[PDB]
Design a protein around this nucleic acid. Structure first.
Ligand code: MG
Ligand code: MG
Ligand code: MG
Ligand code: MG
Ligand code: MG
Ligand code: MG
Ligand code: MG
Ligand code: MG
Ligand code: MG
Ligand code: MG
Ligand code: MG
Ligand code: MG
Ligand code: MG
Ligand code: MG
Ligand code: MG
Ligand code: MG
Lengths: 128, 396, 64
RNA sequence: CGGGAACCCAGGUGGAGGCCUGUAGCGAUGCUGACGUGCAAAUCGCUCGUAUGAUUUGGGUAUCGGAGCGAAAGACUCA
RNA sequence: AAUCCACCGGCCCCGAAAAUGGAUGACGCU
RNA sequence: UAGCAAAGAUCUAACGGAGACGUUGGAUACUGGAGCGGGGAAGGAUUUCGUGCCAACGGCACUCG
RNA sequence: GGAAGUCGGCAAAAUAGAUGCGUAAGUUCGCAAGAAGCAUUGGCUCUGAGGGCAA
RNA sequence: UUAAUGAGAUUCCCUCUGUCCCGAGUUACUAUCUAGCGAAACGACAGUCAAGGGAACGGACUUGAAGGGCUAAGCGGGGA
RNA sequence: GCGACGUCGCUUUUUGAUCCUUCGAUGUCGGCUCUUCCUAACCUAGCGCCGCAGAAGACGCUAAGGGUUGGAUUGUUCACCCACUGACAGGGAACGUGAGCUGGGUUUAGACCGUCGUGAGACAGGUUGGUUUUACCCUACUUAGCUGGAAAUUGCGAGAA
RNA sequence: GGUAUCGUGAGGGAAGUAUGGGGUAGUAAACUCCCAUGCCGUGCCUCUAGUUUCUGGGGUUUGUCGAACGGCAAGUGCCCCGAAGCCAUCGCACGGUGGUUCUCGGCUGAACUCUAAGCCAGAAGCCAAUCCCAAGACCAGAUGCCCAC
RNA sequence: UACGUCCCUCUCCAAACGAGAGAACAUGCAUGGGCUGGCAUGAGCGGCCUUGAGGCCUGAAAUUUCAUGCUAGGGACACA
């Protein structure tokens, strides 16, 4: 895990950078979060979340499923001291265990999500 | 049923103004008589902050790898002039002083500390102690209590003050001398005065007290904010937008019983300007003065020539002219507030607190801006003879 | 060890700028660097570096 | 009127309407805003309803106490 | 040269516990 | 003590005065022609005007009202 | 990030003028409708027409 | 049953946002201090607690525990 | 591990009584917010013990120290699912908490409906719309000062960690 | 006596806590550690972010000073950028200590076993300590300086 | 008449007001220069871009070093 700034509270619509059909990733809840009071579960760059697809194919829509954040539109300060961020939120849609599930990513997957998911980096056009 | 973890820390009550700005070690380390007599504290002045780049160690994931940007603090540390020696009895009501030998000379900044005007005064402070020291009964009544600091004493504390005429900083508006007792943590108290008696009336510079890669504890007084409300002082919560009589409050500050407000509920009052300690602040460089080494911030991988002082000084402090100390991270001061270093309490035996350090880069880019230039002789290289100097370096 | 800026070609000493990964492609570098948020806010607006008096390329056009 | 053995396709004209936006006017929905020892024995702010009308308003003039008057709330009839 | 098989009787051990701090009335007494 | 917090910010000279006050000049403003405008009805009836005055009344003050 | 706040989008934002293009469901054919929805707006020098007074 | 109309009641969606996660900074005006002015509601006396008993949830009683005095700004627990 | 049969102590966020306090007024549930407290331990923490080989559960004791979530529908408490989590334990504090907020439910005066009633009207039936004042006083707390003080302001009264 | 400085510290407060990982080790599984993260706490402003009455610099809009220059009015016109300061689990730093006992494994054996006396041992626990406050705990703590009468 | 403290002024690590940290011929204050940093090419002019990263702002609730300018010492107790 990393000291990534949190960007995607529960109820955020991330879009799908994975050629599996979906378009949105309404964040249902962050997998791994330990509850705190009145605190909205906030996803981060490497975090795996649970999602419902709000736009895309119906064969995956009305269903709770998993996703790993690819890209974060919120600037997190890398520990090397380089504050970096993206055009757009993005998340792959993933196996409940954690696996790629979907055609290799159409976006620059970030470092904080590749070395926490050895199955994403092998499908991502660039790492940044 | 439902609840949350309690707001703020009850072990910093009362949230009260510290009784002096001078940071003062409440407790000095445990006396290990297996060590050498030494000085376990030192007063520095918070210049400001900056950040540096470090070659990392301690194999982990973010470590044993490429460098890291870690924020640091620059604490200007002029040498301290020891004036006295103070010994304590170990009596059943807690330590009590058993006398205080002074030096024969006592710097004119030290004697200001026993005044509040000093310029309409007649400067009689330590007049009958300079005179009576040159006597013979003086030498008697001085070795009569040094021969006491071995019979009755257990804790031996020199009295050091700061050199401020040696601190050409003006924004430190004070010309008194900050006076601080400093524990000696050697062994065999007989040989503990021997140190004290020796370095008395001699300047003690900070590297004599501390070493480079080891950590201290920073007794200091927080930046004050006056009367802060409940949401800022304790960080409780804001009531909803809809609230009447406003929303920056604690709604319920008491049940029916007890029918008194508790000391635990949050209320508005002094925030900041409290005495804090900041255990385990790790020194990264304890570099000497520009008067002796005008290449402070150039270690091995910045072969350029520069100093700690950023472009345009530290904001609100000035230039660092003395034996600065570079800690790691935050220090509970505003600029030009005296900090007291202290050798730490913790066991400190760890691969995260006892590891040595090399600094591959330090930033002298100006605090006042954004700064894109280190070492202003790089700024001149970016630009050209623009019209400011062109109207002077071409008008002759 | 100072990665030079993207839109104004400043020198960015480590820990000052704020890098940026556009949702696009680049064989050169996928991450863009900006010293000041002025340099970036004026890049989503997407001026050109030339035609801006304080950038660096302007100081290859207005200098000759 | 243009244009084609029925009366449709369009072009203008004109300026209707308990029509619309909106100023005054007249109202008072929301903030359950601000005041609540008021500015005020009911006000203030913003929002808001209507604004050619079954409209608003002046003066005069009618109808009042077991009564009057009421598009009716037992409303109003000098707090 | 003592040692048993069953029970009667408590003082006393557990059975038994709450929520402001805490009451033989207080200290204290053994 | 609560308060004297909605609605226009007075600034200056030299003059007067027993003294923050007034007057004049200059300055910057505000009302902004559904007006802090000029006229009337209803109502009030000397509030008009001038010269004084300054006790208490003008919720501060006043040389002014 | 975007109603997860809250009894409740309360409040605030947002929308916005003009012009051009389009504009469904339903329907008492009048409407709905400013539907929705897009699109263009500056400054400048121009070039067009648009009219009263006779051989 | 219904087109239109609705400061009507209701639900969703879109947009939008400090409603919120989670708050932060700024601004007038106040509060604050001052000069001038100056009320009132209210008022037995008052006025630290715990426990006991008690018209059974005490400010006074009982037994303990705190308490030097006078103070300015707050707050809203109590003074049923 | 409890279960026949059974019983016997102690239990209040219990179902009701009682009518003792309050009728010249203890302002109504729920929330928000915040603090506290208890253990009958939900989690972590400590061994214990089994048909407890590892794994992994299994039973138990000790501990109040720390921790115990985010949502959808509901005014709700409760309930229910959703999802996270080490787990989302159970309680008190005047059913903690309106001179703190909110005003959704109770909530009257308007109105509609259902049943009832000859009718006016009734319903602890439904629906909609519907005041939320005052701290400037004492203490509590919170910070902020000042000044006296040892026969705790007095005797000279005398006690030095 | 005053005034001044340095301490003492009775007493009160009190806080750090979870989770994953690597490690040796599919080992008649964990455990000093190594590594992060999260929450809480206390700080901080180097960076990043927010904030702008530096109304800083610029741009622009209606009105307006005869017009530029320059301004001004729009209770800060609007807009872009903006240092300083403040501030964010939006940034950052830091928060791993000694005894004492009971559960308990157990020792000696009496009158064979842990306890009847003699006893080690240790998780929490409590207790101090670090930490915050500080003699109305009235400091015969130490110390600087000094009167008139 | 003592040592001293306090007020007035100034400073600002402090601050609602007190209190605090200070200074009291000092780099103290005020200007200017320089640095540092914001902005983004100034009125005017030559041939619209050129002068030109120009002009302006930069410590002020209070960035940093250099040159010149002025620069209360009076009160109140202590004190009898
Ligand atoms: Mg309200
Ligand atoms: Mg209107
Ligand atoms: Mg008439
Ligand atoms: Mg959206
Ligand atoms: Mg009365
Ligand atoms: Mg008080
Ligand atoms: Mg008070
Ligand atoms: Mg309630
Ligand atoms: Mg909710
Ligand atoms: Mg009080
Ligand atoms: Mg202590
Ligand atoms: Mg203690
Ligand atoms: Mg000031
Ligand atoms: Mg002082
Ligand atoms: Mg200057
Ligand atoms: Mg100054």
């Amino acid at each position: 895990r990393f000291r990534v700034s949190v960007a995607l509270p529960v109820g955020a619509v991330v879009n799908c950078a994975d050629n599996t059909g979906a378009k949105n990733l309404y964040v249902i809840s962050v997998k791994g979060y330990h509850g705190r009071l009145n605190r909205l579960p906030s996803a981060a760059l490497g975090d795996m979340v649970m999602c419902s697809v709000k736009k895309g194919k119906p064969e995956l829509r009305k269903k709770v499923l998993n996703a790993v954040i690819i890209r974060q539109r919120k600037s997190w300060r890398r520990k090397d001291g380089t504050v970096i961020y993206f055009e757009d939120n993005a998340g792959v849609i993933v196996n409940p265990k954690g696996e790629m599930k979907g055609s290799g990513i159409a976006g620059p997957v970030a470092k904080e999500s590749a070395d926490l998911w050895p199955k994403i980096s092998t499908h991502a056009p660039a790492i940044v | 049923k439902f609840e949350h973890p309690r707001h703020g820390h009850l072990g910093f009550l009362p949230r009260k103004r510290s009784r002096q700005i001078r940071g003062r070690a409440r407790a000095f380390p445990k006396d290990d008589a297996t060590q050498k007599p030494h000085l376990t504290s030192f007063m520095v002045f918070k210049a400001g902050m900056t950040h540096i780049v470090r070659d990392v160690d301690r194999p982990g994931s973010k470590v044993n790898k490429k460098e890291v940007v870690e924020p640091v603090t620059i604490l200007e540390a002029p040498p301290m002039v020891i004036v006295g020696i103070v010994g304590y009895r170990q009596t059943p009501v807690g330590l009590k002083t058993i006398g205080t030998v002074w030096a024969h000379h006592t710097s004119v900044e030290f004697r200001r500390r026993y005044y509040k005007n000093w310029k309409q005064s007649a400067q009689l402070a330590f007049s009958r102690q300079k005179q009576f020291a040159n006597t013979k009964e003086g030498k008697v009544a001085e070795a009569r209590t040094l021969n006491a600091f071995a019979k009755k004493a257990s804790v031996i504390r020199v009295i050091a003050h700061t050199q401020l005429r040696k601190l050409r900083n003006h924004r430190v508006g004070v010309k008194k001398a900050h006076v601080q007792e400093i524990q000696i943590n050697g062994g065999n108290v007989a040989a503990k005065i021997a140190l004290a008696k020796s370095l008395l009336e001699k300047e003690v510079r900070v590297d004599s007290v501390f070493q480079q890669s080891e950590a201290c504890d920073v007794c200091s007084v927080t930046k004050g904010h006056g009367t802060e409300g409940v949401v800022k002082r304790w960080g409780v919560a804001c009531l909803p937008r809809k609230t009447h009589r406003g929303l920056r409050k604690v709604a319920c500050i008491g049940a029916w019983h007890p029918a008194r407000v508790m000391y635990t509920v949050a209320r508005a009052g002094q925030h900041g300007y409290h005495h804090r300690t900041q255990l385990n602040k790790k020194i990264y460089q304890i570099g000497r003065s520009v008067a002796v080494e005008p290449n402070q911030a150039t270690t091995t991988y910045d072969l350029t020539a520069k100093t700690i002082t950023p472009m345009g000084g530290f904001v609100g402090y000035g230039t660092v002219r003395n034996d600065y100390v570079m800690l790691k991270g935050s220090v509970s001061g505003p600029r030009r507030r005296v900090m007291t270093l202290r050798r730490p309490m913790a066991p400190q035996t760890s691969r995260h607190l006892k590891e040595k350090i090399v600094l591959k880069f330090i930033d002298t880019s100006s605090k006042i801006g954004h700064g894109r230039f280190q070492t202003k002789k790089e700024k001149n290289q970016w630009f050209g003879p623009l019209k400011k100097d062109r109207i002077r370096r071409e008008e002759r | 060890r100072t990665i030079e800026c993207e839109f104004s070609h400043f020198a960015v000493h480590p820990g000052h700028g704020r890098r940026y990964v556009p949702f696009a492609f680049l064989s050169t570098k996928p991450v863009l660097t900006f010293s000041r948020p002025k340099c970036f806010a004026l890049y989503m607006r997407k001026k050109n570096p030339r035609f801006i008096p304080w950038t660096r390329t302007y100081r290859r056009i207005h200098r000759k």
